[PDB]
């Protein structure tokens, strides 16, 4: 399938134990996509002072369309030193590894894979 319905657990930034997916733009996109497939991926909602508490490069999910079965359609954009790799709509938040943190909420998404 080109798109896959996912329920992403929404983590508070100060609970996140692994604060990024790697060390290159290509690696963080790669790892982000792998964790999404394996259901080991969390979402940190972006607010003032969140991003400097996580590790670059960042992986964002961004709205790719205006929502089948309540799932917002999204695609991955990485950012390193203020340069984005990818072009999409509004940030739903930054992706992080999930290692059993307790979520505050779930974000229903349709991921372009």
Curated annotation (Swiss-Prot):
Source superkingdom: Viruses
Domain CoV Nsp1 globular: 2-113
Effect of substituting residue 37 to R: In strain: Omicron/XBB.1.5, Omicron/EG.5.1
Signal sequence region: none
Places the protein is found: Host cytoplasm
Segments for region (Disordered): 1-113
General function of this protein: Inhibits host translation by associating with the open head conformation of the 40S subunit. The C-terminus binds to and obstructs ribosomal mRNA entry tunnel. Thereby inhibits antiviral response triggered by innate immunity or interferons. The nsp1-40S ribosome complex further induces an endonucleolytic cleavage near the 5'UTR of host mRNAs, targeting them for degradation. This inhibits the integrated stress response (ISR) in the infected cell by preventing EIF2S1/eIF2-alpha phosphorylation upstream of stress granule formation and depletes host G3BP1.
Protein known as: Host translation inhibitor nsp1
Gene transcribed to yield this protein: rep
Residues of the full protein shown: 11 to 125 of 7096
């Amino acid at each position: 399938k080109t798109h896959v319905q996912l329920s992403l657990p929404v983590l508070q930034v100060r609970d996140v134990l692994v604060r990024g997916f790697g060390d290159s733009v290509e690696e963080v996109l790669s790892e982000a996509r792998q964790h999404l497939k394996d259901g080991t991926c969390g979402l940190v909602e972006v607010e003032k002072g969140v991003l400097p508490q996580l590790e670059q490069p960042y992986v964002f999910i961004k709205r790719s369309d205006a929502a089948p079965h309540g799932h917002v359609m999204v695609e991955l954009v990485a950012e390193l030193e203020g340069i984005q790799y990818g072009r999409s709509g509004e940030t739903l938040g930054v992706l992080v590894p999930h290692v059993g943190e307790i979520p505050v909420a779930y974000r229903k998404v349709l991921l372009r894979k």
